Amino acid sequence: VLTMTDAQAASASFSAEYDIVVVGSGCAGLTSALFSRWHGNSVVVLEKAAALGGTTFKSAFWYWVPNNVPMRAAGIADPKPDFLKYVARVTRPQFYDPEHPTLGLTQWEYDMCEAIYDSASPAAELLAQKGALPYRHVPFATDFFSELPEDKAKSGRVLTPKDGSPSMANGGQVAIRTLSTAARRDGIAFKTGHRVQRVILNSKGEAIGIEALKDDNSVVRIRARKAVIFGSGGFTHDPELRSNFLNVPVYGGCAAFTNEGDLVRITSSLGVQLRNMNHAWLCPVTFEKAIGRDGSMSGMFSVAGDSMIFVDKRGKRVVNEKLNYNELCQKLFEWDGAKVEYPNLVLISIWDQRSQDHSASNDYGSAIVPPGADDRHVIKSDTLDGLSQQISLRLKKYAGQIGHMELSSDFNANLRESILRFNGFASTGKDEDFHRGERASDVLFNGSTKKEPDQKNPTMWPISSVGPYYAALVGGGTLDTKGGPKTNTHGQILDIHDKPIRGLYGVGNCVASASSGAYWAGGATLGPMIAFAYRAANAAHGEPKRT
Template sequence: MTSETSRVSRRNFIKAAGLGAASTAIGATTLGAAQAQEENWDAEVDVIAVGSGGAALAGACGAIDNGASVLILEKADFIGGTTSKSGGGSWVPNSHHMQAAGLKDDRDTFLRYCARVSFPELYNDQSPTYGLMPNNLKLLETFYDNAARVFEKLDQTGAHPTTMAMSWDNQPGADYHGQIEENGAIRGRQTSPRDEDGNEGFGFHMIMHMQAYVEERGATILTEHRVTRILRDETGRVIGVEAETPEGAKRFRALKGVIFGSGGFTQNPEMRANYLRTPIMGGCAVPANEGDLILMASEVGAKFGNLNEAWNQQVVLEEVLEFSSVASGVFFLGGDSSIAVNRFGKRMYDEKYVYPERARSHQVYDQWTGSYPNLYQIFIFDHAAREFGGMLVPTLDTDVSATTTVAETLEELAEKVQARFDALADRIGTYKLDPDFLANLKETIARYNGFAETGKDTDFHRGEAPADAFFHSAENKRDYPNPYMAPISDTGPYYAVLLGAGALDTKGGPVFNENGQVVDIHDQPIPGLYVAGNAAASPSGKSYLGGGGTLGLGVTFGYMAGEHAAAQA
């Protein structure tokens, strides 16, 4: 996600942010049979899709492709949700693009990889179920068995034209944990949307194609329609929704089903604090993603899962404090002569590794001090690193960002970094660098520089993961054995950016079955109620399986929910 590729304006962000969850009564209402028949419905269709991002629009496509009439209700005043400002990639096992390229992706390897990284505490390499809970295994099996079919269908119909995502050196993309044995060195699962000219595109191209597809086939999309209540009949079947609109409350009837693809709860501070294990401060999700479905689904007896997890991503601290829905998170820590350190002046990870795993480092807890030692982090780079590009590393010819600290010496840098934390105290509280920060930082840089000279980072394996090479070009290689490391200069200027924990969006909510149906606390489907995407309990558990992991699952199960709903009596 980058501000350059986003089609969602800052004005629209701020306007959508006014849709606070606390201002609206959200829940569910039961209508008797006579009342349902006599209700003056504002519209009646077969299927209602709530939201207009990739998961919701895929649900609309699945319903339309199977003969259903569709209405799409969007809370914000723009179409596309978080998908519209994303890179638009989708992680698709055994995709038709992989098959055409002769890339093997067998089912057992896929399931073993997913189990290993999604639920590492459960993974059992000797078990026929890989140690997984039955529903999660079933969903991952369903994903493998159907994702390629769904994406090929969407590609062929023109609803979502795609291509295989390639790295900077024209190689099929690696998975985010491609270095572990269970991955099987599989490449090519990530797909990208195509733009108007058939070239590799972005999330707004995906939305553009899907929107055109559903509207050309009779679907209506209504923005500024915030769904606030699930409507049921006396049997418990979901028969429609109530929405808050600029014209007042309206009720819409769904003869076959309601599909929620309304996103997660990243922009709901109370839910973030209550549910998430990582201290998330905000993130890329659009302001409308406030967890409305969790409140509604609670009243219809839905079962919930994975509420403690998110699609993690680092964010620039001062940006997320200014506005919790940031234009872009920190996908890359650029430059070769650069490191990230904590308040003790010590490194924590491979700085070139994928964003969700770097973000997870913020949740490390020290039981002795009762604090998070990595809660806020400092990304440090020298002047030479600016020549080698990448996120947060300006070019030589441009001014540094307002969120970047510049100093001529490391002593001055430490003082200025502490001053920046002090200036934020009214929002983050007192946050002090350790008294040994400067001494440790000098030792850390000396140790790192030794790794750069030898090309081997024995602490964190920088540059060794396949995903490192996928995301970071080595074309501007300096004369060092590892193109992703160069020594940090003995002289300034030095630069620093403060980092916090954020998310692309959360990934917990109602549990669903292989048809996309929301299940109750007894694991029985709630008739007429479906969910997909970040509004749901993701079967990917703790992990970000590969580039496009969120949309791959969301689109697949969204489309299948539409198929299933359309087939109902």
């Protein structure tokens, strides 16, 4: 924090002044800046990196917008009481109660969920109308827990950028292009290489600006007449914060590497409530790309291959490999208190030539990659016994990160047994152990497969008894974190007495999500974020101009 006396605030103390100062150039920052600019305010976006877009650039930009205009025009109602029941059941399973006045949620979580329902659609419509985020409907994207009877609009809520690829995998690049192009068009200023590091307060404790560290190690002070709106992302890539706050000891994530939790430090001397700090948006990752800091990494949202299993270091299956990524990641952190170890800490995806040829993908974090792609993480052997030798060497390379994990002495025998058992399940279509393929979301993210006339369940096919074979290490990671200072439903960052710190706002992964540890559907990070960017810019516009 920097505090200015009245004299200082009214002097030549600032190198620049705007009505609204936005911090970060991902979805939260760009949309907050656009909505602010369209209310007639002067706006600057300050970005720590040399490039715009943050994690959002990397995303597929599915965005889950309840009650949106396309789904209604398509005749698909999204009744508010039933929307609230779906999200309450998924978010707070222990406390969900359809007879309780807030469904078993706290008043804050209920109010935040209502705010997503009320505001995501008008936000989406305005961004599209102005040309900053034109969209198309994604009617076939079903919610991640659509089988729950509380979900009364099981598909229809997803939008994505109009010019996203067919697979949607580059939707984030298209969104950052449209949003940033519109923002520049619209007279929003951008300052890159500006790492915000303090909020400046006046004598009344109101936010009146920021201090940023520039790349020459000089500092600048920039005045906000109305509001400072943080959209600075999460803290996946500050390992100390990640380790000390999250509920699982993840290895990294697909978040931009500049997402280091600066707002946690900035607000440490402002009296905020840090909330939801124990949760991230979770996903499995290609382990070596996380340790190797491959900035192109995606989370493993689609675990590719039908003639493919995951095994643990014993050579046994432990999980439905097609389970929703936010839930599958948690299996990797099961704790064995007797052995003082995480038995699933790394799992090994193993596949055959059929899945290599017909399930490879450049998209959605697949470990199986097509010719010409980066395959440094793919282990290869002509035989299963050779493959285990190579898996062992790979585990040894990372010993100091994974408890000096070793394959069981019985790995080879156990893997052969596991494959024979899996192949029987693949032949009947019924995975009696882990129910792979029996929920619709398992199929949604199944990936590509070779068409087989006899195939009973599209998520499984027997692994060939002839090589070659392929493997990759899978570890647990994030998309990014989703905890931070608590806001009200208009994005105002609160003090410990639940009262706004005047002039201070936050949107997106830098503030607390109301979704706890849950991931409701594809697009469940960005759709709510656009709702709160809209509500925050609307409230920020109403602030008095201050000194």
